[PDB]
Design a protein around this ligand. Structure first.
Ligand code: HEC
Ligand SMILES: [V+3]
Length: 106
């Protein structure tokens, strides 16, 4: 999948999480989001296409996904413990990090 597919996967599963009826449903969407984040971490966003692959911008882009995954992994901990509401609030914490990378690189 390309970066656009990964973003729609992140967007769709965040909506799945918000509408979920139990924590296993949240757990399942979070794992799909984890996969999509690591995949997206390997892409070059179009705005940075003529930057060096070693550029500070490209490393900042990749590191935004590391922090997103960290957050996804914390939400997964709550989902595995059966705490549906806390895991959902944990998933909402992702949104500002989605937004901060978009502001720089969308
Ligand atoms: C950088 C570390 C990002 C993080 C974290 C998130 N997104 Fe993102 N997103 C990013 C880029 C560079 C782009 C442009 C994609 C392109 O190919 O030009 C996007 C785009 C989106 C979109 C629009 C996709 C499209 O059809 O063009 C969506 C819906 C989207 N992003 C959602 C999204 C969500 C929900 C995130 C947090 C879970 C998130 N993104 C994080 C870069 C980054
Ligand atoms: V954070």
């Amino acid at each position: 999948a390309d970066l656009e597919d990964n973003m729609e996967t992140l967007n769709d599963n965040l909506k799945v999480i918000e509408k979920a009826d139990n924590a296993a449903q949240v757990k399942d969407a979070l794992t799909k989001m984890r996969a999509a984040a690591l995949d997206a971490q390997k892409a070059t966003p179009p705005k940075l296409e003529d930057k060096s692959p070693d550029s500070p911008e490209m490393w900042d882009f990749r590191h935004g996904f590391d922090h997103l995954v960290y957050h996804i992994d914390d939400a997964l901990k709550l989902a595995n413990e059966g705490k549906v509401k806390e895991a959902q609030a944990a998933a909402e914490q992702l949104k500002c990090h989605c937004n901060a990378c978009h502001q720089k690189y969308r």
